[model samples]
Target: SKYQVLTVGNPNSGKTTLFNGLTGAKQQVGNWAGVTVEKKTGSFVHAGDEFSLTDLPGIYALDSGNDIDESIASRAVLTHPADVIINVVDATCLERSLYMTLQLRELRRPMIVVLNKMDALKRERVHLDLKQLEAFLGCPVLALSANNKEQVRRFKEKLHKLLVQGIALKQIELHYGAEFESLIHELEPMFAEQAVSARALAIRALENDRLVINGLKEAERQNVEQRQHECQVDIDLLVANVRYTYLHELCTHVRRT
Candidate 1:
């Protein structure tokens, strides 16, 4: 059976470039989910097995979209479940790429994080501890220079291994620390029947997600708002800050430094 895969990342994270590298010219371009935002699909054989890869429009998060193009990507990911997800990230900007990675983990889907733009990392002298990042994110992470022809071919073999074996790495689950973790667990039961993952809904609820907020009871919405005010922190910024702090720790021990 041919497995279906989805490629996702932030805009300018080189997701499209990596998709083209893997799929080459044998791709079909069309609108996604009956919308005008462009979607690309292509099939490739790896290790004697065939798999279909769909490239969604790049966006920062599934819960956030500022335009039609962004919304399409979020919609495709949340509504259409895939066999696996390839989260493309810029090696030079782990801080930026990882927020989405954390959110994707909430869905509890099979995933591999592709660290794109290794070439840029070299240019800018940015170094990332691959093992630490993989551990932190609880997924296999491959560093690839999308523009390097030789590396692209090597990545195909690496990619094939992941597709054959669900996840081979020693994955470490992310923890949001005590208080927030407690809140997420506490909120999970209330969000049990939500179509989305309870963990995701909890984070969104903390972030004041409009769709999620609208779905909540007025009392629950008020509770979240009240907590936000009491904490005096934007949950969105808090999440970002936590990821960056960990990213900094990862970079601190890198060989380059």
Candidate 2:
């Protein structure tokens, strides 16, 4: 079986390096349609199964409306029919990396969080509890330096095993307290039939995502507006705050410097 995998991460996070290590010299690169952003894809066989990996242009967040590369990355992540997503994260800046990680989790796809630049972490005398981090994210987490051949080999093996036997990942639900949680639930059913998770749709709708908002029914749109007024809080900031708070607390417990 051929499994499709997408590599996504922030710029300078060594995402392309990992893609190179995984695919060796088998990659093909080109520009994205109607945009200058680069697109790269390569395939490799792992234990008799083929895996095709596409490396998306690096991005900090999915919905950076004005950035071309960000928009390209976001569209690919949301619309691509990939079997698994490989989120390459910089270990030295785990907090910033996790902001996107939380967003990716909302997509509810099978994913692996790769903590790149472990060599830098070692030199800086930083320690990460990989197991605890994995527990918090509810996905498999791997720490490795992209330049290390041995570590890349191990990653391939691990990925192969996960692809073959499957992974039982917990559903990570961020608690946004009572008000937002209730509101999210109320809007969820409206998006239940969409490809993206209903909960994610609801959250985006609350965040005033233009595309999401435009998709809402007339009454649903009015309902969201009324709720926003009643809450008297910036939904965008509130969403970001809750995610950062979770990541801050998560880092505090799982990291040592």
Candidate 3:
């Protein structure tokens, strides 16, 4: 509560719900000029100490229309203002939720995931195998509620400890495939010249993120296109395809449209 925290998640994932409850009438909203998408920030009480919370606009996928996810998430990390990032996730939709988790890790921040709405998890009759998830992510995993007093307090305590320790939960190891990893290595040299981080460049290369594409010179773009097509891939389309592929492998109940 002594410093700033950023709250980010996908559309309608209860980011605002938890934000309001935590900060309560202390929040403000605004927009990014280039995109004109509104953004939010607030300062509120948790465990009797007041803290700042910034609410980032929601989006569907990391490889969506713009590099907004990468941009905003990156800004949160690089700015001299943030102490922790509470990345909210939907419990019932872990399959989709994990994509953002995978993207957030690329920011290299002190991230704590808030798995919201536990009652829905109960209604679904499922629990996140947290022990396995903790091992898989190599970070703290808290299964608590946004509405309940008990869970929120527990969340605050965990967040406080994370802030005090200043330890990054090791990057959540995200695996797309050997093909993708190979592509990342191929693109690293190109990113070595850019302002963006290497993994960000890698994901943008995989997604064919045209924001990055447009930033390149004419020759570089064409070379990138050719390299992508060599593997029968298009930057943007293939990225979603790979994510959908990975998602298919994770959950039995969900299917790609």
Candidate 4:
């Protein structure tokens, strides 16, 4: 295969629809190892190059916590071997859908954001500034109705160009304000030896992600908790608020009705 691609997104975001469009009838469905969560894999040839694609279960966030389906998706995103990640987003609810996109961007992988349901967006008279969105995420942003064969074909061509050229976009870091930034910087060194990126680990730790906290050493966990207390605010809520604030601002700049 020329490349391996993974598709990730929130539930009801047309992720599977896009997958079906990409791979047609060449898909295989089965359970994910021991779990009941369904797994789908397929391959398609583009410009004489074969690309294998995996459709991950729809999930809102990587911090799966206790949800079985979400856990499977989160684990896949964290550990799955793939050359490209396609984040399918619901165009009708861009802000809510983009929360996951922001989290995925932190993984620092080669990614493309696909805004599905463009037909619905048009009916609602919603307009998206694609250039601004591409600039913000530092990756390709495509708007299309996944069920539309013509649009899907265009998407495949664009994807082929991306895969062939191997264009690497600079990763964009979200600014989490001064206090949080300093805290992330301070805690980064503690997780320097961990498998995950230090910045991602630090942010997840501050967000009080259960999986991340469990992985931390006793002292490391205490250090993060103490800093959260000193800040005098719920760190998890603060992180969510910061991301929502940024997304709100971004939508205002890029969306029109």
lDDT of 2 by residue, 1-257 (tens): 99999999999999878888899899998888777777898999988889998888888887632316766776677668788899999999999999999988887878889999999999999999999999899999988999998999999998888878775678786998899888888888888877778898777777665556766689988997777776657677788899999999899989998
TM-score, ranked from best to worst: 2, 4, 1, 3
- Candidate 3 residue pairs in backbone clash: 30-39, 207-235, 208-235
lDDT of 2 at 213: 73
Best by TM-score: 2
In the range 1-257, model 1's lDDT, one tens digit per residue, is: 57788988999998777778888887998877666677689988876788799887777776541226555655555556677789988877776677787777766667889988888888887667777677667678889888887897898887777777776543335566776777777677777765567777777677665556766688888776766665545566677777667666656664363
TM-score per candidate, in order? 0.81, 0.91, 0.78, 0.90
lDDT of 4 by residue, 61-171 (tens): 777343276667666676688888999999999889999888878767788999999999999998899999888877888889999999999999999898787857657
Lowest lDDT block of 10, candidate 4: 64-73
Per residue, candidate 3 scores C-alpha lDDT tens digits across 1-257 of 37788787887678877877777777778875467667787885656666777777775454433526556544444342577767788877887886777666665556677778878888767756665665554556566668776677667777777777785567645655677677777777877844446777666655665456757888877777666766644556555665556555554432222
Model 1 alpha-carbon miss at residue 153, Å: 2.4
RMSD of 1: 3.3
Question: Number of clashes in every candidate structure?
Answer: 0, 0, 3, 0
Candidates ranked by lDDT: 2, 4, 1, 3
The lDDT leader among the candidates is 2
Better of 1 and 3 by TM-score: 1
